[PDB]
Amino acid sequence: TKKDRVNHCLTICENIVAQSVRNSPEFQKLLGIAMELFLLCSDDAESDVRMVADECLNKVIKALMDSNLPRLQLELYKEIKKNGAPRSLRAALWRFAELAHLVRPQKCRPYLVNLLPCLTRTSKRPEESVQETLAAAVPKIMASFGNFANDNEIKVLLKAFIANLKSSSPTIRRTAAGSAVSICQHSRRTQYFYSWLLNVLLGLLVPVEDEHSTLLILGVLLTLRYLVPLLQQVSPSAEQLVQVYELTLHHTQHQDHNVVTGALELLQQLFRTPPPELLQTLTAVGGIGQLCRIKGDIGQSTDDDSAPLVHCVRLLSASFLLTGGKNVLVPDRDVRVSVKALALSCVGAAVALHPESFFSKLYKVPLDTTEYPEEQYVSDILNYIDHGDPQVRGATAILCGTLICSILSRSRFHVGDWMGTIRTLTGN
Amino acid sequence: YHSKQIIGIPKIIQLCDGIMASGRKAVTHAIPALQPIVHDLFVLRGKELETQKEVVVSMLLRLIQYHQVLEMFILVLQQCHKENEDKWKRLSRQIADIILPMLAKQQMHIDSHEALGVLNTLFEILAPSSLRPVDMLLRSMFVTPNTMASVSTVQLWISGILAILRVLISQSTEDIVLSRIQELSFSPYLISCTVINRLRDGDSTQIKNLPEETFSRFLLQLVGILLEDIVTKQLKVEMSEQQHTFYCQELGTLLMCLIHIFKSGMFRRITAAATRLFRSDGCGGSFYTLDSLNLRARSMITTHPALVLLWCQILLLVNHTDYRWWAEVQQTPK
To answer: Which residue of A has its CA nearest to B304?
Structure first.
């Protein structure tokens, strides 16, 4: 039966392709039988029969793509419509999303309306394999069907994936985060939904002093990380773009290293591609105030005497890179290499915007002068060029390889004049 | 189709009208649709053709703020110049009465080298009678922007000034321009340093001086404005990379215009007043002083050598042979 099925599938598979007349009504039914059989045959215990069913299922699609795609798209949509086995659902999902961009605009609204419950139902599937296939299918489907969607239809899809941000499985969380951002990106009112998603994401975590699930924090931070690059030009405002920055800064102090890693990854994303509204606030002296342990006073994000990036660089160094003592590398057992490498990347990106933050003292107000007789500067992070692992050594080389470019650019190639005041202002 | 037409020109205008009367961008949808229409009706083609021509012209007027449409009007004006001389004068007057108020309100999209270049050739193609009374030209030049806290608005405001300034020094004479500046009560304190500081925040609220004194004061303040925000502006934060190079291009053509005014000798009264104003203090900080201008120019040596040399040429045209500025650019050994 195993060898018979493989030969049985192949015989039908070659029969469809090697048929001269493709317009006969009897062939249309015959096409709907082979496609249904291959999708059913895509769920088999043996890998060999599954592999050949997969292999020629797209070969009959490619041969019939030029002339019989509308039936192929319809046939593949029926398998998505019924929530069957994971193997037969993923096979019909990644194939349909691939051919979505060949759907003519006439059959776009009818397809999207029918696909709204299918994408919502697939988001509730607990299988990690299904969620991986669905993660890549949504941007492909939305890139074609997104502009045919209603205002409230995008909300229904967005709320479907938002509820998946608190799941324990990282694959489910990543699928929900990517799909939600991709849904907003491929919509008629792209900027309106960016604000709507940003407001919803903040509302899930804006009571920072309250208690939130670790999974929820990881999911929301990942969603913000995907959304930030698309915010680089109702529209997203400075008030909520700052709240994301404060939310990111607060969660770098979390006790779980997974949350710290997620917060740090978003923080550097906020600096690699900073939205213009947030960039001016971060580099302004008034800044936000206008509108392993931290032992001492480093300042506040809302200080009215220095740019917020000065405190951010201080916060990163005092938390993950520097202790209170000069030339004392933070031990690796307190914060791991991954956090140290990530922290140095954030500092370098922050320095690229505000080079003056690199030369400040580690602590705004000096701590006890007995245990730590000499004050330490943020520039001590360059001692990580001799770290034991290559990622931290490379991040440090990038760090003040960027500092060289930023100082020369900001000073307009007057280094002695620029470095003269930074030496007087900070004592560095 | 065997004595039957498939599609008519009026239907094509209507299809173009529907595209331009929707939420689609005019640069990528309306303008590319119009380009083969005006090139067919005007360049290569008595009672019905004229009505379509006027309808197309009316559509172009609604998109006249785009420089791509400005090139289309150049094509229409050039063709109209040959066929009917009288129609060329009336069309030029209609265009001049529209774009010139728009230049004053910064409503034209001339914030680029290409757009400003197109607008310059449109002014030359226009009929001279449409700009011979320079009262309207001067009134649209001696204006102030809504605010100077935005890079785009400052560039748009300066771009419009440069286009009108070029027309004054090419299609008119110094005697004509200055006399009209006397009759129209223009003041040198239009964009004085007090007004500049107010506008840079974002707020939109004497002795009988010669017109050459106010004309030279007006041009010198723009030099200070461009120099101020070329060096005191973060590249990735405040402006963009395109906004930075257009700032230098705007300064380059403005200093180029100043050099021609001083060097040609056709603007003796303006040059004499400008030479005197370079030597005077800024009336207690109301105007940019020469020392302040040189401070902003010295900083550009390491970044914009091309513009500093243009400033050096201007300093010689006003006989500023002081070695306070020349012993530094030349790096004279001590």
So the answer is: A412
